[PDB]
Amino acid sequence: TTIKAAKKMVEREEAVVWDILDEVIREHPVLLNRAPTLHRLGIQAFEPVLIEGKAIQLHPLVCAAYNADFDGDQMAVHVPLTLEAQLEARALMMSTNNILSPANGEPIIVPSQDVVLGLYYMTRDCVNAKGEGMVLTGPKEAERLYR
Amino acid sequence: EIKELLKLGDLPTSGQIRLYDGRTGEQFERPVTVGYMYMLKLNHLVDDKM
Amino acid sequence: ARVTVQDAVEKIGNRFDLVLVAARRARQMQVGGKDPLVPEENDKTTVIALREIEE
Amino acid sequence: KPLVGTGMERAVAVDSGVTAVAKRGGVVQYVDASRIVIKVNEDEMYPGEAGIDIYNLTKYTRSNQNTCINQMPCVSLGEPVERGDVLADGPSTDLGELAL
Amino acid sequence: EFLKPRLVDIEQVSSTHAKVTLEPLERGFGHTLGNALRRILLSSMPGCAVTEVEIDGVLHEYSTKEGVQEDILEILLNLKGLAVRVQGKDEVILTLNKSGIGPVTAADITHDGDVEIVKPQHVICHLTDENASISMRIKVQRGRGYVPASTRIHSEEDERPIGRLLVDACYSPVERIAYNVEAARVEQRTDLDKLVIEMETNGTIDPEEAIRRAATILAEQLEAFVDLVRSANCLKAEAIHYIGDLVQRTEVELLKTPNLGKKSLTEIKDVLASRGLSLG
Amino acid sequence: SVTEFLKPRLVDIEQVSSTHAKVTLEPLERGFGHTLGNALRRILLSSMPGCAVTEVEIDGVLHEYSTKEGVQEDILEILLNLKGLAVRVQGKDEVILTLNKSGIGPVTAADITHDGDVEIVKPQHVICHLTDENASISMRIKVQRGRGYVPASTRRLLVDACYSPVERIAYNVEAARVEQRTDLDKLVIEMETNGTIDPEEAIRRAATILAEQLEAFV
Amino acid sequence: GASVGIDDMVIPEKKHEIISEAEAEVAEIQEQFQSGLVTAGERYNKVID
Ligand SMILES: [Mg+2]
């Protein structure tokens, strides 16, 4: 009924305020930022995903632009308010729109140190192995044969 | 000396054993190194930082 | 699913006027009682405006 | 009590003030979660009315960094204590050894 | 055409270490059943755990009593590892009284009929003064999984008695599972393997009663294979017990009867002033 | 509440193909997603009833490394094309068909003899191409009923019979919340079939095969 | 499941021979300098090389 009623409801944390917060969270971008902001890729926009805990989860492909490992780093979250701010967060600094560094056209989302090891283990070629020298109908048959 | 101490007990002298996945029961190749490390808890808690 | 805005930028504009026209459209949708021209799957004014931008 | 150490845990544990080292040897007369009473041998006792030794272990308190500081006895009744033995384990101490 | 498995044998190495067999199994079903049974025996198995123990002379776990070498926190810590088996009910309150120099094992606990102590030599505390005694009430319950005391901060049911001490509850009795598939006998038919499950627990559950429960849970989850008092007495005199029957009629209609009193009318007015009931 | 486990509600059964679906079970208990998914995937892959081609002999060829004039393909390629053939054998356990045809043009599955109970599900499936006016092809395809994938080395030309009618299956567990708890699972199953049976039916078949193995205990 | 062990870092078998040859060469290339043939700077530049 009044603002004080909603304030008390959020203070008591009813089971409905979570389903209400999910509505506003669905399509409202937020800005993440690490302490030393050298270039402009130190501030990007993401779509929040409500998770249980007290730590932020960061996609392991945007760590190169932030220059952020996981040994204690912290980042700040900013919430755009107006319509123009949200449209700029979506159309100018969304994480999926900044994949090429402005210093050189080369990409900045290249995986490393965990993804390249697995792909290097898949695309390896051994000499003697089980199932060597046969003919398959396609890649799905190879997946079935491996699993 | 570490190898002799591993051989006193009934333990593999190589240091690596074969593990199985817990979610599928499948066995990892390239037997992994399993042992006991002394870990510490530093006074940087996420409760004092969020 | 507004994952990217590539096609909207490719269609027309200099990536700056698009923000302004989408803001005007979303403001007319939210404050004004103008009905949307596209069906909404529990979406906000900004996403609906960006999706209506394409034609 | 780390399984793999260097042998420098005894020195660090004892030289600090976190533990409760026995001043004079003897026998544990009364052990408790907060007090330890040691009956001193007749030879180590001073001539005129020497008496006994009593150790009041510090219980749950705060540090400069807001951490707990409490001691715990590691002896039992009748145990013969010698001069220099550890009678209580402070924070990060296991039977008189550094354990972080 | 599939040879269904049977419960052939159930070995017993000790009170806790068991070894079961599930002959006969076809090709490719050994591991398929073994892993799916291990993941259920580890995750969800009912059990009993100590919680909410109250001691007479304490107010919080950070204190210490006299004539006792252990600490209250250590006592609450080693009470957590008490293996109890309860068959009658799901909520028991034990009692532990002892005095004199000597340890305090699990045998010293009360001897209620529907409560079995699996390990009587489980040392709980140590007394070090003949002029000392301990008296506590151990509240056992029943559940599954791991529920820490920190989650019991709802504060919407009742208030905490200052001398009540919460305990973490490890309900799961199972400790570890180690299955292994291997070739069975000839059986006049090849491609027949056996499943040898090797469980271990705290001696509070039976191997067969655990396997038959894990399989039951698995089947129940797999079943989803389809497509898709005077104030109250004044109202009760008119056979009205629920508040809805009184709220269906207006306060003027309720005041038109001699069964209602002055105190009942005042209570009804005080309840209606909050706009919750009796609004016509 | 000791044996009160949650039950999924598979409202999302959306599919974008006739022989390809994507089922979504939600919500499950923590740890049941991987269990159920892996069990059903292992069963659907390694133990599934079906009929496929086992061995095919050629009229005048008795070796793998040979060739016949007028055919745009090779023996290996036509054997690989015969591996992809899907046949729903009814009644009898096995039966041997033939491919007697002499005509210019691609040889489709409709050119095979009907042979009564044998019902081809993909008449558009092309086996080989013919270009000469006198080049005739003749072979004796032999179907057989089994369970699983049997290679050639495990076993006239041999054919790796794919009895299981599933082309691929890959589950994916996710996170689900019911009003308080974000630790619940959300199973998502993706499977493509070869057209003999719908995947929604294959899920039921695998679940039934798994449930019938737990009768002596429940 | 690619771990890292103590045996996963193999030492070459002929490293000891190389070290012995190098130290035997140095045990006389310094005495050659001590005879006044070469200067200290060039001797240092040869030793580092
Ligand atoms: Mg860092």
Q: What is the DSSP string of B1-50?
A: -HHHHHHHTT--TTSEE--B-TTT-PBPSS-EE---------S--GGGT-
State whether A72 and B47 contact (CB < 8 Å): no
Q: How far is CA F94 from the centre of its chain?
A: 18
- Do A and C touch, 3+ Cβ pairs within 8 Å? The answer is yes
State whether B38 and D2 contact (CB < 8 Å): yes
DSSP H stretches of helix in E83-147: none
H, E, C per residue of chain D: CCCCCCCCHHHHHHHCCCCCECCCCEEEEEECCCEEEEEECCCCCCCCCCCCEEEECCCCCECCCCCECCCEECCCCCCEECCCCECEECCCECCCCECC
CA–CA distances in Å: residue B13 to residues B4, B30, B32, E112: 8, 16, 13, 52
Closest residue to A140, CB basis, from F80, F168, F183: F168
Q: F99 and F59, same structural domain?
A: yes
Helix (H) or strand (E) holding A117, with range, is helix A115-122
Cβ burial, residue C5 (10 Å; 0-12/13-18/19+) = buried
Mutate one of A51, A74, A117, A124 to test the B interface: name it (highest B CB count within 10 A).
A74
Separation of alpha carbons E116 and E104, rounded Å: 17
- From chain C, the residues in CB contact with A87 under 8 A are 19, 22-23, 26, 46, 50
Contact present, E18 and E207 (Cβ < 8 Å): yes
Q: Is A19 annotated as a binding residue?
A: no
- Do G and C touch, 3+ Cβ pairs within 8 Å? The answer is no
Note down the domain range covering D22: 18-92
Contact present, D22 and D52 (Cβ < 8 Å): no
Separation of alpha carbons C40 and E254, rounded Å: 51
Separation of alpha carbons F86 and F89, rounded Å: 9
Separation of alpha carbons D60 and E184, rounded Å: 61
- From chain A, the residues in CB contact with F65 under 8 A are none
Residue F75 sits at φ, ψ, to 5 deg, of: -65, -40
Q: What is the DSSP string of C1-31?
A: --S--HHHHHHSS-SSHHHHHHHHHHHHHHT
Contact present, E49 and E223 (Cβ < 8 Å): no
- Do B and G touch, 3+ Cβ pairs within 8 Å? The answer is yes
Q: How far is the CA of A34 from the centre of ligand 1 (A)?
A: 9
Separation of alpha carbons E44 and E210, rounded Å: 10
CA of E108 vs chain B CAs: smallest distance (Å): 38
Separation of alpha carbons A73 and A34, rounded Å: 8
Separation of alpha carbons E56 and E61, rounded Å: 12
Chain breaks in chain E (C to N over 2.5 A) after: 228
Q: F118 and F31, same structural domain?
A: no
Separation of alpha carbons F167 and A145, rounded Å: 11
Amino acid at F49: P
Separation of alpha carbons F196 and F166, rounded Å: 9
Closest residue to A143, CB basis, from F151, F152, F168: F168
Residue E86: CATH number of its domain: 2.170.120.12
Chain A: which residues have CB within 8 Å of chain B?
Answer: 54-55, 72, 74
Note down the domain range covering C32: 5-53
Separation of alpha carbons F155 and F159, rounded Å: 10
Q: Which residues pair with D73 in a beta bridge?
A: D88
Mutate one of A86, A94, A98, A99 to test the C interface: name it (highest C CB count within 10 A).
A86
CA–CA distances in Å: residue A24 to residues A11, C28, E54, E270, F110: 18, 20, 46, 39, 57
Q: What is the resolution of this structure in A?
A: 3.8
CA of B38 vs chain F CAs: smallest distance (Å): 30
- From chain A, the residues in CB contact with C20 under 8 A are 84
For residue A87, which of C8, E35, G41, D69 has the smallest C-alpha distance? C8
Residue C32: CATH number of its domain: 3.90.940.10
Largest CA distance in chain A: 75
CA angle A29, A32, A34 (to 5 degrees): 175
Cβ burial, residue D2 (10 Å; 0-12/13-18/19+) = middle
Question: Which DSSP category does C55 fall into?
Answer: -
For residue F85, which of F121, F49, F114 has the smallest C-alpha distance? F121
Q: How far is CA G46 from the centre of its chain?
A: 12
Q: Is A73 annotated as a binding residue?
A: yes
Q: How far is the CA of A63 from the centre of ligand 1 (A)?
A: 10
Contact present, F130 and F105 (Cβ < 8 Å): yes
**Residue F51 contacts by C-beta under 8 Å, 6 or more apart in sequence?**
F87, F88, F89, F143, F144, F145, F146, F163
Question: Which DSSP category does E149 fall into?
Answer: G
Separation of alpha carbons C46 and C30, rounded Å: 10
State the helix-helix crossing angle for E30-43 and F32-46, rounded to 10 degrees. 170
Strand segments, DSSP code E, in A7-130 are: 30-34, 43-46, 75-78
Q: F34 and F119, same structural domain?
A: no
CA–CA distances in Å: residue D37 to residues D56, D83, D84, E126, E130: 9, 14, 15, 17, 16
Q: How far is CA A136 from the centre of its chain?
A: 37
Residue E117 sits at φ, ψ, to 5 deg, of: -95, 120
CA–CA distances in Å: residue F138 to residues A65, F59, F119: 64, 6, 20
- From chain F, the residues in CB contact with A144 under 8 A are 45, 149, 166-168
Q: What is the DSSP string of chain F?
A: -TT--------B---SBTTEEEEEEEEE-TTHHHHHHHHHHHHHHHS-EEEEEEEEEESS--SSS---TTBSS-HHHHHHHHHT--EE--SSS--B----B--SEEEEGGGS---TT-EES-TT-EEEEE--SS--B-EEEEEEEEESB--TTT--EE---B-S-EEEEEEEEEEEEETTEEEEEEEEEEEEE-SSS-HHHHHHHHHHHHHHTTTTT-
Q: How far is CA E108 from the centre of its chain?
A: 23
Note down the domain range covering F34: 1-49+164-218
Residue E167 sits at φ, ψ, to 5 deg, of: -130, 145
CB count in 10 Å sphere of residue F164: 23
CA of B24 vs chain F CAs: smallest distance (Å): 6
State whether B43 and D4 contact (CB < 8 Å): no
Q: Which technique was the structure solved with, according to the deposited record?
A: cryo-EM
For residue E145, which of E38, E49, E45 has the smallest C-alpha distance? E45
Six token digits for residue E246: 């009184």
**Residue E66 contacts by C-beta under 8 Å, 6 or more apart in sequence?**
D32, D34, E129, E132
Separation of alpha carbons D20 and D87, rounded Å: 5
Amino acid at E232: A
Residue D77: CATH number of its domain: 2.40.50.100
Question: Which DSSP category does E236 fall into?
Answer: H
Separation of alpha carbons E38 and E207, rounded Å: 13
State whether D65 and B43 contact (CB < 8 Å): yes
Six token digits for residue F39: 């069990």
Helix (H) or strand (E) holding E103, with range, is strand E102-104
For residue E231, which of E272, E199, E196 has the smallest C-alpha distance? E272
- From chain D, the residues in CB contact with E70 under 8 A are 33
For CA atoms D6, D11, D16, D18, the dihedral sign is positive
Amino acid at F45: L
Separation of alpha carbons D70 and E176, rounded Å: 35
Residue E116 sits at φ, ψ, to 5 deg, of: -115, 130
State the helix-helix crossing angle for E207-222 and F199-212, rounded to 10 degrees. 160
Amino acid at F66: S
Q: How far is the CA of A71 from the centre of ligand 1 (A)?
A: 6
Separation of alpha carbons F128 and F77, rounded Å: 8
- At A44 the three-state DSSP class reads strand
Instruction: Please name the residue of chain D whose CA is at the shortest distance from the CA of residue E75.
Output: D33
Separation of alpha carbons A54 and A77, rounded Å: 13
Based on its alpha-carbon atoms, the radius of gyration of chain D, rounded to whole angstroms, reads 15
If you count residue pairs, one on E and one on F, with CB atoms under 8 Å apart, how many are there? 91
State whether C50 and A91 contact (CB < 8 Å): yes
For residue G4, which of E52, B49, B15, F61 has the smallest C-alpha distance? B15
CA–CA distances in Å: residue B38 to residues B42, D12, D95, D99: 13, 18, 18, 10
For residue D87, which of D49, D46, D50, D58 has the smallest C-alpha distance? D58
CA angle E93, E95, E98 (to 5 degrees): 170
- From chain F, the residues in CB contact with B24 under 8 A are 34, 38
Domain count for chain C, please give it. 1
- From chain E, the residues in CB contact with D30 under 8 A are 128-129
Q: b vs e for E77-107, b when ≥16 Cβ sit within 10 Å of the residue's Cβ?
A: eebeebbbbbeeeeebebebebeeeeebbbe
Cβ burial, residue C43 (10 Å; 0-12/13-18/19+) = middle
Instruction: Please name the residue of chain B whose CA is at the shortest distance from the CA of residue D67.
Output: B43
Q: F150 and F122, same structural domain?
A: yes
Q: F185 and F131, same structural domain?
A: no
Q: F126 and F76, same structural domain?
A: yes
Q: Which residues pair with F70 in a beta bridge?
A: none
Residue E274 sits at φ, ψ, to 5 deg, of: -85, 5
Strand segments, DSSP code E, in chain A are: 30-34, 43-46, 75-78
State whether A28 and C44 contact (CB < 8 Å): yes
Closest residue to A87, CB basis, from C3, C4, C46: C46
Q: How far is the CA of E83 from the centre of ligand 1 (A)?
A: 46
A47 and C CB contact within 8 Å: no
Separation of alpha carbons E144 and E173, rounded Å: 9
Question: Which DSSP category does A50 fall into?
Answer: -
Separation of alpha carbons E187 and E194, rounded Å: 12
3-state helix, strand, coil in chain E (%, to 5): 25, 25, 50
CA of E39 vs chain B CAs: smallest distance (Å): 8
Chain F: which residues have CB within 8 Å of chain A?
Answer: 41, 45, 76, 79-80, 83-84, 149, 151-152, 160, 162, 166-168, 175, 177, 179-183, 192
Instruction: Please name the residue of chain B whose CA is at the shortest distance from the CA of residue D2.
Output: B38
Q: How far is the CA of A55 from the centre of ligand 1 (A)?
A: 15
Q: Is A22 annotated as a binding residue?
A: no
Separation of alpha carbons F6 and F12, rounded Å: 18
State whether G1 and B31 contact (CB < 8 Å): yes
Separation of alpha carbons A75 and C22, rounded Å: 30
- Could you identify the residue written with the tokens 């017990």? E241
Helix (H) or strand (E) holding E253, with range, is helix E251-255
H, E, C per residue of G1-49: CCCCCCCCCCCCCCHHHHHHHHHHHHHHHHHHHCCCCCCHHHHHHHHHC
